[PDB]
């Protein structure tokens, strides 16, 4: 499991909970949607891009 399309539109809190069940050692970082980010690939990382309401705005994926 490396993508969570079912989490789009959910709260950032539920998204963290679900991702950590599937990937307990995940390094989760929450970022604003519409930022630009570094393009290194980190197998342990899941970036969560949130809208201004703190809901998930893009499909979370490993990297």
């Amino acid at each position: 499991k490396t993508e969570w399309p079912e989490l789009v539109g959910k709260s950032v809190e539920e998204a963290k909970k679900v991702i950590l069940q599937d990937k307990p050692a995940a390094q989760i970082i929450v970022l604003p949607v519409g930022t630009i980010v570094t393009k290194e690939y980190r197998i342990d990382r899941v970036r969560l891009f949130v809208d201004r309401l703190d809901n998930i705005a893009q499909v979370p994926r490993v990297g």
């Binding site: 970022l31 930022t35 630009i36 393009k39 290194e40 690939y41 893009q58």
Partner: protein, 281 residues
């Protein structure tokens, strides 16, 4: 003793070094998280920070900009690694914070600083899934002004027949770079689409890290600076060549790999690019 990372050899940079060309007097902006100027295997010539809460471009609180910088230009000496263009004039243009992210306006401000300061090459090992008119105008302005602009394609992998190249890589004016490993196989994370231009090594790439360290990173972020460094080598051998000519020299001399949707034109070959007459090997 110094080590030559495999990716520097793979793109045939040592052939330029043996001809006597190492990127001298070429100005390369690494538009990124900063560069640790205290690293003994880097020489940072200047820079500026566009990050409101992190005003020192010579402090890299993430590590990513320092790694990217070492692939462009780690020094030729008896330590650490060797860069693609070890004599290049390296500029730290900090537009990303410690967490690896930046606002579109910070990236645009860095591109504008690069244009105003007469950079020859911009490397952007960064991206997002959406563009903006202002972002497109900044990259198009840099290219109109003569700058070679290189960016990571993205690490979005495949999505059927859809392009997964992000911005600014996805803009026609920017050279979008995908990642291969030491056997020339596309990395599974490497973005795909007709906007993919060329490939370079992006798997297990050894480079400089902050606090006088070294390590192996993976990403289209690691592939982009091989191409930005190759552009600096080409300009050091042909100082009057335009950005148009440096870009075509790289595109016209790749080693073709698979289908262009997955590999673009193939692996860059800076030895062939820096000849007068160009063809694929």
């Amino acid at each position: 003793a110094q080590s030559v990372p495999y990716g520097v050899s793979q793109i045939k940079a040592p052939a330029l070094h043996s001809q006597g060309y190492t990127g001298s007097n070429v100005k390369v902006a690494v538009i990124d998280s900063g560069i640790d100027s205290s690293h003994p295997d880097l020489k940072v010539a200047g820079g500026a920070s566009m990050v409101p809460s992190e005003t020192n471009p010579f402090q890299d609180n993430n590590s990513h900009g320092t790694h990217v910088a070492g692939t462009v230009a780690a020094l030729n000496n008896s330590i650490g690694v060797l860069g693609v263009a070890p004599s290049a004039s390296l500029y730290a243009v900090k537009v990303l914070g410690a967490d690896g992210s930046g606002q579109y306006s910070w990236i645009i401000n860095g591109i504008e600083w690069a244009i105003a300061n007469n950079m020859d090459v911009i490397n952007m090992s960064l991206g997002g899934p959406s563009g903006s008119a202002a972002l497109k105008a900044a990259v198009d302005k840099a290219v109109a002004s003569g700058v070679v602009v290189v960016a990571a394609a993205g690490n979005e992998g495949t999505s059927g027949s859809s392009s997964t190249v992000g911005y600014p890589g996805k803009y026609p004016s920017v050279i979008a770079v995908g990642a291969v490993d030491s056997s020339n196989q596309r990395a599974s994370f490497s973005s795909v689409g007709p906007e993919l231009d060329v490939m370079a090594p992006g798997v297990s790439i050894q480079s400089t890290l902050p606090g006088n360290k070294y390590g192996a990173y993976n990403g289209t972020s690691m592939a982009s600076p091989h191409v930005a460094g190759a552009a600096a080598l080409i300009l050091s051998k042909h100082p009057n060549w335009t950005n148009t000519q440096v870009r075509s020299s790289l595109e016209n001399t790749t080693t073709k790999l698979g289908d262009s949707f997955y590999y673009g034109k193939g692996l860059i070959n800076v030895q062939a690019a820096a000849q007068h007459h160009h063809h694929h090997h």
